[PDB]
Scaffold this active site. Structure first.
Site, PDB file in Angstrom:
ATOM      1  N   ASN A  14       0.817  -1.216   0.000  1.00  0.00           N
ATOM      2  CA  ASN A  14       0.000   0.000   0.000  1.00  0.00           C
ATOM      3  C   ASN A  14       0.848   1.262   0.000  1.00  0.00           C
ATOM      4  O   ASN A  14       0.307   2.352   0.148  1.00  0.00           O
ATOM      5  CB  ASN A  14      -0.947  -0.004   1.227  1.00  0.00           C
ATOM      6  CG  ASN A  14      -1.767  -1.288   1.311  1.00  0.00           C
ATOM      7  OD1 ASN A  14      -2.673  -1.530   0.501  1.00  0.00           O
ATOM      8  ND2 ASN A  14      -1.419  -2.144   2.268  1.00  0.00           N
ATOM      9  N   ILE A  66       1.446   6.908  -0.412  1.00  0.00           N
ATOM     10  CA  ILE A  66       0.667   6.080   0.508  1.00  0.00           C
ATOM     11  C   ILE A  66      -0.782   5.967   0.121  1.00  0.00           C
ATOM     12  O   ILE A  66      -1.480   6.983  -0.005  1.00  0.00           O
ATOM     13  CB  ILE A  66       0.728   6.699   1.955  1.00  0.00           C
ATOM     14  CG1 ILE A  66       2.200   6.834   2.394  1.00  0.00           C
ATOM     15  CG2 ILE A  66      -0.049   5.844   2.950  1.00  0.00           C
ATOM     16  CD1 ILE A  66       2.437   7.908   3.486  1.00  0.00           C
ATOM     17  N   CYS A  67      -1.249   4.735  -0.036  1.00  0.00           N
ATOM     18  CA  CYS A  67      -2.632   4.537  -0.399  1.00  0.00           C
ATOM     19  C   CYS A  67      -3.410   4.370   0.894  1.00  0.00           C
ATOM     20  O   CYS A  67      -3.465   3.289   1.463  1.00  0.00           O
ATOM     21  CB  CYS A  67      -2.781   3.294  -1.268  1.00  0.00           C
ATOM     22  SG  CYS A  67      -4.491   3.109  -1.787  1.00  0.00           S
ATOM     23  N   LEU A  68      -4.004   5.462   1.351  1.00  0.00           N
ATOM     24  CA  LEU A  68      -4.778   5.470   2.583  1.00  0.00           C
ATOM     25  C   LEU A  68      -6.056   6.264   2.335  1.00  0.00           C
ATOM     26  O   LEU A  68      -6.007   7.394   1.847  1.00  0.00           O
ATOM     27  CB  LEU A  68      -3.957   6.117   3.695  1.00  0.00           C
ATOM     28  CG  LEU A  68      -4.650   6.305   5.039  1.00  0.00           C
ATOM     29  CD1 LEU A  68      -5.078   4.946   5.602  1.00  0.00           C
ATOM     30  CD2 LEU A  68      -3.688   6.998   5.987  1.00  0.00           C
ATOM     31  N   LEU A  92      -7.180  -0.725  -4.328  1.00  0.00           N
ATOM     32  CA  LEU A  92      -6.233   0.352  -4.611  1.00  0.00           C
ATOM     33  C   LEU A  92      -4.777  -0.009  -4.294  1.00  0.00           C
ATOM     34  O   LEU A  92      -3.900   0.842  -4.393  1.00  0.00           O
ATOM     35  CB  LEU A  92      -6.613   1.596  -3.811  1.00  0.00           C
ATOM     36  CG  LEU A  92      -8.096   1.960  -3.820  1.00  0.00           C
ATOM     37  CD1 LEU A  92      -8.347   3.198  -2.954  1.00  0.00           C
ATOM     38  CD2 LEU A  92      -8.526   2.199  -5.251  1.00  0.00           C
TER      39      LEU A  92
END
Lengths: 132, 152
Positions: free
Chosen positions: B79, B86-88, B121
């Site tokens: 992620n 950063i995929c958050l 994602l």
């Protein structure tokens, strides 16, 4: 209000990831995002029509307060490009009058515009595929 | 516009007077919206041996707009990509003014403890984590030792 170099480059990257010019990182894992590859499609109504030019852009430690260094890989016959090295000369207006608000997009677009001035549009170009 | 919003001033002060365990965050003297952040790798995770460096920036429209953050330390995680992006959820469309910098930092710390390769994602590292989880975790541990700051 001053966007740090790293985040300004992240901004340009995102914009580049999503029609006459393009750019992206030369190394997908280059965390400093220093070296970029750029491409310019030659303008219409000129000896650049249907040609695609590859370039290298280096955004150093002080970018965007300082302009980036731009070098053509694809050979091109254009006055602001050093005919031996492919380096775009410092006197080119965009580099000469560089503003922090300017981006790699600004530079690529300005170079494409330069390819279309009456005096530049009639210059004979190298054989397709040649490099500096 | 002659001063920083009180909210940024207060959040900044609180990040110092009431720090999150395992996390440090402080602004640069020449840009009070630009922060140097460090997050300890969670105990019992593949990242436990190191401390990770991140950078954070509060855009002019913060808190209507989400803070921007990214890892400077090279990391192998499904992620967090090769550029440290950063995929958050809370850093994207789900950000809202009700959240704060602390929320984001805690969420990143939790993401290190719990990688999620099945997220729609997730990045390209996800396939390795799904097909060979043991090898992917070994690479993440190896990269922690090679690239992160060492813990005492």
């Amino acid at each position: 209000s001053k966007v740090p170099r790293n985040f300004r480059l992240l901004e340009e990257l995102e914009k580049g990831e999503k029609e006459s010019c393009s750019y992206g990182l030369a190394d997908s894992d280059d965390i400093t995002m220093t070296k970029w590859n750029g491409t310019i499609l030659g303008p219409p109504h000129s000896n650049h029509e249907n040609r695609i030019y590859s370039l290298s852009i280096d955004c150093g430690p002080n970018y965007p307060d300082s302009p980036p260094k731009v070098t053509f890989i694809s050979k091109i016959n254009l006055p602001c490009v050093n005919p031996t090295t492919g380096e775009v000369q410092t006197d080119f207006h965009t580099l000469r009058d560089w503003k922090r608000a300017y981006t790699m997009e600004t530079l690529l677009l300005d170079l494409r515009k330069e390819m279309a001035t009456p005096a530049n549009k009639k210059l004979r170009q190298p054989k397709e595929g040649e490099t500096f | 516009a002659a001063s920083l919003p009180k909210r940024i001033i207060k959040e900044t002060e609180k990040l110092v007077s009431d720090p999150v365990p395992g996390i440090t965050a402080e602004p640069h003297d020449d840009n009070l919206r630009y922060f140097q952040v460090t997050i300890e790798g969670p105990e019992q995770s593949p990242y436990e041996d190191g401390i990770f460096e991140l950078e954070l920036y509060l855009p002019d429209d913060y808190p209507m707009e989400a803070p921007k953050v990214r890892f400077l330390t090279k990391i192998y995680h499904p992620n967090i990509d090769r550029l440290g992006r950063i995929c958050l959820d809370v850093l994207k469309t789900n950000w809202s003014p009700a959240l704060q910098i602390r929320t984001v930092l805690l969420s990143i710390q939790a993401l290190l403890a719990s990688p999620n390769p099945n997220d729609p994602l997730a990045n390209d590292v996800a396939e390795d984590w799904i097909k060979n989880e043991q090898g992917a975790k070994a690479k993440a541990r190896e990269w922690t030792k090679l690239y992160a700051k060492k813990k005492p």
